[PDB]
C-alpha cells in the first residue's frame, strides 16, 4: 500500500454533498485541511493551481520507478557502467527533502538549522560519532548551495535513491578506489559533485528530451490518479471566484494530462454534460518558470492551442475567452484577474517554488499539497504510542544514561516505520527542514487539495496565535 493507493482509494468514492456528511467526513484526519495560519475562505477570490503532483498526482511507486529506469538508461547511454541496469527502484529508501552533500557524497536529513538528523553514505547509515569526522559540528551551512542540493520534489525521489545506489555501487566495485570526495578509476577521477551533476542532468534530460512524458501519456491509468471529485470542486470554486492554472509544464503535455483528468462521461456531477478541461479556468498559463515567475518572470507569450506552439512575439492583448498564456509573471495573473495577493489561494506541491516564493514575494495565500501525507498520516496514528513514549522519555530525562540510549532506540524504531530515511516531517522528536518550511509558508496543507470539498466556502480555518516565551 503506497501513498498514492490511499489517494486513489479516496478518489474512487463519489462525493456525498450532504451538509452533515461533509462535516462528518472532515473529522477524519485523512480528509482534513490542516491550518498553520488562520484563513477566512470567504476572502479568497481566486483559486490558483499548479498541475504536477497537485491536479495530476502520479501513482507510486510506478511513476518513480519509470523515472528511475529512464534516468539509469540515460546514464548508461552516456557511458556509465552496465551494472547500473541491475538497479531497481526501491520506494522504502528515499524520503523527500533530503540534502545531497556533493563534497562527501552523503544524503543528509537536516532540521531548519542545518543540524544533522540522518547521514547515509550509499546505503551505510552513519552513526553520530562517525559523522563528526566530516561534520565536526553535526551541522551544514545551508547557504552553501554549490555544495548542498535540497531534493525538494517528488520528481527528485528517483534521483534520491539513484544517488545512494551509485555511491554504493562505486564504493563496493573493485575497479574503483574510494577517496574522500569521489572515486578514482585509473587516470579518471569522478568527484561526487560531477557524479551528482550527471544524475541531475540525466533527470532533466529524461523529462525534457527523453521519453518520460511519452511513456506517461501512453498509459495514463497506470501513472496518474483520476478523481471524479476534481471537476466538482473546481466547478464550485468557479461559482464563488476565479480559477487559474499556472504550471511549469508545456501546453501539449498539460492538454494531454488535463484531458485525461476530466475524461468522465459527465461534467462536474454525474448526469451533467461533459465540459472541456479549459472551461474550468478563467486563466491558463503554461511554461510558468516558477519561482522566477514570482519575480520578473519571462516574456508573456500566447499559445496557439491548435498546434501547441507559441505564437511569435510578445502578447500585448487582453484576457480573452479561450486564450492560453505561456511564461509571463505572477503580476500577469493578478492584473488580468484584478486580484491582490491576499485574494489568491495558490495550491501547489513545490514547498520552495510554489509556496515559499509566492508567499514571500507576493503575499499570496498558500495551500501545500503533500502527496505522501496520506501514508505519513497512517503511520503517525498507528505508531502514536511510540511517539508518546518518546515524549515521556524526554520529559523524564529533563527531571534527571540508560534513558538516552533508550531515546535513540525508540527514535530509530519510530523512524523506520516511515522508511529508511524516516518521516518527511521529523526524526524522533526533531523536526525536519521540510516540516519547518511547511509550518512557516503553507497557510493550509493536506494530502490533497480535494479535501477543500469537505469545507463550506465561508469556512474560517483557524490556527492558534503564536506567543513568545515571555508572553506566556
Amino acid at each position: 500500500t503506497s501513498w498514492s493507493d490511499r489517494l486513489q482509494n479516496a478518489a474512487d468514492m463519489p462525493a456525498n454533498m450532504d451538509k452533515h456528511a461533509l462535516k462528518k467526513y472532515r473529522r477524519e484526519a485523512y480528509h482534513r485541511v490542516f491550518v498553520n495560519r488562520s484563513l477566512a475562505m470567504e476572502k479568497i477570490k481566486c483559486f490558483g493551481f499548479n498541475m504536477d503532483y497537485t491536479l495530476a498526482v502520479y501513482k507510486s511507486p510506478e511513476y518513480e520507478s519509470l523515472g528511475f529506469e529512464l534516468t539509469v538508461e540515460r546514464l548508461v547511454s552516456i557511458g556509465y557502467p552496465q551494472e547500473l541496469l541491475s538497479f531497481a527502484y526501491d520506494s522504502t529508501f528515499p524520503t523527500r527533502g533530503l540534502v545531497f552533500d556533493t563534497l562527501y557524497g552523503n544524503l543528509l536529513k537536516v532540521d531548519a538549522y542545518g543540524n544533522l538528523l540522518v547521514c547515509a553514505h550509499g546505503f551505510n547509515f552513519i552513526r553520530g560519532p562517525e559523522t563528526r569526522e566530516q561534520y565536526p559540528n553535526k551541522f551544514i551551512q545551508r547557504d552553501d548551495t554549490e555544495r548542498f542540493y535540497i531534493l525538494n520534489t517528488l520528481f527528485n525521489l528517483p534521483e534520491t535513491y539513484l544517488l545512494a545506489c551509485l555511491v554504493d555501487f562505486f564504493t563496493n566495485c573493485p575497479r574503483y578506489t574510494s577517496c574522500e570526495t569521489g572515486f578514482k578509476d585509473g587516470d579518471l577521477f569522478m568527484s561526487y559533485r560531477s557524479m551528482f551533476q550527471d544524475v541531475r542532468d540525466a533527470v532533466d534530460w529524461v523529462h525534457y528530451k527523453g521519453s518520460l512524458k511519452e511513456k506517461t501519456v501512453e498509459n495514463l491509468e497506470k501513472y496518474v490518479v483520476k478523481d471524479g471529485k476534481l471537476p466538482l470542486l473546481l466547478s464550485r470554486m468557479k461559482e464563488v471566484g476565479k480559477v487559474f492554472l499556472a504550471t511549469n509544464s508545456d501546453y501539449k503535455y498539460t492538454d494531454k494530462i488535463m484531458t485525461y483528468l476530466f475524461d468522465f462521461p459527465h461534467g462536474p456531477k454525474p448526469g451533467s454534460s461533459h465540459r472541456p478541461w479549459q472551461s474550468y479556468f478563467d486563466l491558463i498559463l503554461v511554461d510558468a518558470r516558477k519561482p522566477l515567475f514570482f519575480g520578473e518572470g519571462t516574456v508573456l507569450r500566447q499559445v496557439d492551442t491548435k498546434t501547441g506552439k507559441l505564437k511569435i512575439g510578445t502578447y500585448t492583448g487582453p484576457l480573452q475567452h479561450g486564450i492560453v498564456y505561456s511564461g509571463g509573471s505572477s503580476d500577469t495573473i493578478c492584473d488580468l484577474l484584478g486580484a491582490k495577493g491576499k485574494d489568491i489561494l495558490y495550491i501547489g506541491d513545490h514547498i520552495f517554488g510554489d509556496i515559499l516564493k509566492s508567499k514571500k514575494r507576493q503575499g499570496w495565500r498558500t495551500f501545500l499539497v503533500i502527496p505522501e501525507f496520506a501514508q505519513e498520516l497512517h503511520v503517525w496514528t498507528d505508531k502514536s504510542s511510540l511517539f508518546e513514549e518518546l515524549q515521556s522519555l524526554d520529559i523524564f530525562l529533563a527531571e534527571l544514561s540508560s534513558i538516552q540510549r533508550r531515546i535513540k532506540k525508540v527514535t530509530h524504531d519510530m523512524d523506520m516505520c516511515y522508511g529508511m530515511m524516516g518521516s518527511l516531517f521529523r526524526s524522533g522528536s526533531r523536526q525536519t527542514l521540510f516540516a519547518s518550511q511547511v509550518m512557516r509558508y503553507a497557510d493550509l496543507y493536506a494530502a490533497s487539495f480535494i479535501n477543500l470539498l469537505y469545507y463550506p466556502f465561508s469556512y474560517l480555518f483557524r490556527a492558534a496565535h503564536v506567543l513568545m516565551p515571555h508572553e506566556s
Copy 2:
C-alpha cells in the same frame, strides 16, 4: 523612567550568591532568561560577547539624543536647512525594527511576512484604507533591499526618529512641494531615497569620523551603564570555560569603554584585587566586521595594544597571552579556542549580524540581549488585562461588526502604552518581524546577559517541543 533606568537600577544591586536567593531572584520576569530552544549550559565551553549594547549598555534617552544631535548637526553642516536645529529627540516615537520605505518615505512596522502593521508618513499615522493606495496588498517585498531598509539596532533609534522629523518638516514647509517619491525645491528634487542615504551617511560619519565616541568617553557615567556584577559573571564563566570578545568597534574605543566597565576598587567580588579588563578574556578581537565575520571575514591582523594601531601584515602566529586580534573570521575564534559551534554561546544585541548569522552560518548557540526589554516587560505585565481582553475578542469574533471595531480600538490603546510605534514584539495580536527573528534565531534572550548570573552553570534551559497541526 527609561529602559536603561530599569537596567542601571538592577545594576546598582550587589549580587547575592546564596543558592536560594538566586532561584528566588530569577522567578521575577525581569531577571529571567527566556528560552526559545532548549540549551544545556553544561555543554557550553566558550562564552563570546559583542560589546556595544551588550557589555556597554548606553543610557537612554541621553545616548540616543546625543547621536540624534550630532547627526542633525552633520546634516546641517553639509547643507540641510537650519530648521533641523529645532528638532529634539523624542524617545516616545521610535520603536526598533521598523522598515524605512525609501520609495514613498514611510516608516513601516511589519510582521515576518511583510504584512503592514503600522504605517507613518512623517508623524501622520496612516490608517488601513489609505495605505492601500501605496500598498495595494498591505504587504511589502522584504527581498527588495534597495527599496526597504530595516532599522535593526538601538544605534538606529535616532535616525528612525530623524527620518520622520525630516519627512514631517519638508512636507509642511512651504518652500518644498510634496511629490509621491520626494520633495521638489525649485530646480532641485530630493527623493526620499537620497534623503535616506544622506541620513544613513551622516549617522555613519558621526560614528566613524565625528565626535560621538569622543563625547561618550568624556562622560561615561552619563552615557554608559556600569554594573559591578559584570566582572563577577565573566569571572565565573572563565572558571568553567573560555571567554572571548568579538566586537565591530576599534581597539582604542573598546579599551576606553571596557576600562570604564571594569573600573571598580576591586576585582570580580568586593575585597578582591582589581584586574585589567583584558584578563577576563581568553581571546580579544576587534574590528570584527560582523556579519561578514561569520563568512570569509577579513584578513587577521594583530593590534599593537600600546599604540592602538594595527601592526603591518597578516598575523600568522598563535594565540598568546596578551595578544589582541583585529578582523579575521569566526573560524579564527573556533580554531584558536579549539571549539565547535555548538560549544559556543555567543551573546549579542544585533538580531541579524550577531544572532541570525552566527546561528545560520556556523551553528553557534545564541543569547540575544534586548536592552529595551526591561521596559517592554514592565508595560506587558501592567497591561496584561488589555491583551487578555484582546485575546477574548478574537475568540468571540471566531464563533460569530462592532467586535471588529473594538478589536482595533483595544489594539491601539495597548500599542500606545509602548510608544507611538508600539511594542518591539507586536501590534495587538500580530507579531512583528523582530519577534519572529528572536524566536527563530535566539536560543536564549533577556534584557541583559547578567541574568545568567541567577542560573547555575549546569542549568538546563528548556523550551517546549514544536508540533505541526496534524501532530497535535
Copy 3:
C-alpha cells in the same frame, strides 16, 4: 567564381617542392603569407590548428546556402510564416564582420571606433543624413553588447543575410505594422531583439541538434575543400616541431571531416603509405569551448575514440599516444607539449575566439586564415585603379565640393565590386573593425594556412616597425 572556387583551384595543384619553384610561387599575392608583426619561424616549436574553416574549408556558396535553408526551415518549424520558404540565400549581400543592431534592426559595417560605414535596414541602404535620426553621432558604443552583435564568422554569413531578409519581409508584408524597435502583428509584438534571438537560437539549433552536420558528412565533396597538400604541410611541421588540434567541434564530427581531409591513396606525398589523420598530431583536443578555453577552460576529459563518447570523470593521466582530449584549457596544451606561448603558432579563423584571445590571454603567436581573402585579393588587384583614384581625390581635397561628391561615388563603385556590403577590410578609404583586429592580433594572415608550404622553416617573416608621429 566564389572564394572557395579559388581555394579549391589552388588545392587541385600538386606541390612543387623545388626551392626555386617555392620562392617564385610565393611571389604571387594569392600564395603569400602577409605579416603584421615580425615572426622568426625557427622559434616556433608547436603548430596548433582549429578545424572549421581552417583545415576543413567549407565550399561557398553551397555550405552557406545549406545553413541558410536549414535555419529558415527551423524558424518555420517553430512558427515563423510560410513565406520564409521563398527566401533563397544570396552570397552577394553579406560581408563578414557586420554588427546587428538589435534595437533598430539594422546591419552596420563599422570601423574600430564604432563609426558607421554602411547601414542597411532590410535591403534598404540608408544614406548619411537619414542615419543621423537613429545614430546622431554616426557612432555605436561597441561595449553595448546587449544591443550590438558582431557577426564574426563564416558560419554567421547565412544569418547575416537572413536577418536582412526578415526585416525586409516583415516591413513589406501588410499583416505587420512597422515600429521603431520591431513589428506589431495585432496583439503580438516582435522586437528586432527577440527576432534576432530566434535567428541566433535557430542557427545554434541547426548546428547542434539539426541536420547540418549530417547533411555535410553525407556529401563531403560538395561541401568541403580537399587538398593533397594538407597532409604534406602537416607532416613537414611535425618534422620540426609538435602539431596539435584544438577544435570546438565534437570528436565524432571531427573524425568524419578529418578522415575525409586525409582520404588520399597515399600519405604526405604521392607514393607514400596512407596514414590515419590522428597520426599527424601530437595532441588532439575537441570540445575546446574557445575562447573560455584560453582562460579557466573546462574540466579536462578523455574521449573514448571507439564510441566517440566521453569517458566518465576528469582525466588525470599523461599525454599518451592515441589519447584524445575533450575540454580542458590552453594551459593543458602548453603543459603537455612543454611549450611557452611564444613557442606556439596557432592557426585559426575566428578573429576573436582563436586569434585575439590566444594572443591577449596567453601570448601565443597567431596565424589568421581568412577564407574569403582569395576573392578579396582578386577584386583588390583588379580594381586597384579605383582605390588609387580614391587616394588621389583625398590628397587633392586636402590641399583645398564636387570633389567630396566624387569621393562618395568612387567609394560606392569600389565597394560594390566586393558585394552589397563591400569589402571585409574597408569601405573606400575607411578601414573596418575587422581589418583593425586582423592587424592588431594576427601576426600572420592569408587566405589559407597552406601558403606556409611556400616558405622555408627558417623563414623570418618581417613587418616594418611602427613609429609615433613625433618619431618620424
Copy 4:
C-alpha cells in the same frame, strides 16, 4: 632641467599672434600638435578640458616630491617603519605607465601585448634569463587586473618610486625575510599585494583627506605652472565655439587653482580688463568621476558657489549663466551644449579615463596632453643618432651574434638617457603600451594644449591613412 622647466620656459613667452610668426613657431617640434587621426578643426564646436595636469600643470619634481613626502609620512603614521623617513623622491627612477605586479612585487614596463620590456625588483633591474623564472613567456595577462596595476598618471609617479623604495628597503633590512610573494616579519606576513594596497590607500588619503591640496594652494608659484597664453587661447576657443570644464576635482580646489591660473593684471591679452576664470566657460562641471562619467555617471548636482557645498537634491533645471554642476555624465554636457560627440574636442591627460573612454564610449574627438613630452622630445632629438644606429642594426641583423649583443647595448644606452625606466614611449625599438594607447585613442597629442594657439581654427590636422600589408 625637468619637463616642467621646459613648459614654464615656453609659458613665460608672450604670444606673437602674427600669422607668419605662428606658422614659423609650430615648425619646431616642441610647439607642434602631433596627429594620429585626421581632424578638421572647423568641425569642432565644443572644447572641453580636464584641469589637473592639463590646465594646472604641476611643477616637477617639486610636486611629485611633495606627494611622495606626504605619502611616506602617512604610511609611517599608520605603522610603517621609521626608516621610510630616510627616503627621498628621485625623479630619475620612475617612468609613467609602468605596471606593478602585486604577486611578485616587480615594476614592469610592457608593450601593448603584455610582453616584458623592463623588470625591476626594487632597484634591481632583472635581465632576460632571470625574468623567465617568474615570467616563463616574458608576458603578463593584462586582463588580470587583480594582479597587475597600471600606473597611468603623473599623480602615480611618487608611488611608482615609493613601491620600488619599499621593496628595496624590506629586501635589504635584516628584520624581514624575503619570500616569493612578500616579506615575513616574525609572525606577520606582508604580501606585495597588501603593501601595494597600503601605498595606494595612502596616496588616496593624501589627496582626499591629507594636506596635499592645502600645501599646494599655499604656494602656487612653487607648485603650478602659470601661463598668460592660457586665457588667450581659451578666449579664442569661446569665439568660435563653446568651452567646458569637466574635472574630477572638487569646486573649492578648482576655484583656488583656476583663480591662480587666471591671476594676471589683465584678461586674455595685455591691456584688457581681467575676467573671472568662470567667464571663460559655457559649462563648468566638477566631481566628474571619470571614467564612470562617460557611462551612467552619477546624479547631477548643483554647486553653491558661495559656500563650495552641494545644494541638496538632484538638479533638474537648465544651463544658466553662473551655474556650476557636480557629478552628472557626459550626456549632461552634450545635451546642455547641444553637441554630438564628434563636435567635441576633449583635452585631457588621463590616457584611460579621459581619452580612451571618451573616444570609445562616446566618439568624442581627443587631445592628449603629455606633460613630460617636452623633456622626452628633447632627449629624442638629441639622441636620434642612437635610435638611427638601432634601426640600422635591426636591418643588418635581418639580412643575416655580436650584432644581437650590440642591439641590447645600444638599447640600454638610449633608454638610460630618459631615466632608469626609459622612455614613456618605448624601450629601444619596442613600443610601450602607453605609446600604443596614445596612437589608438588620442586623435591629437602634445606636451601642452597651448600648442593649439599656433594653428588657425580652420586648420586641417592630417594623418596618413593606414593600410594593411596586402594593400601596400
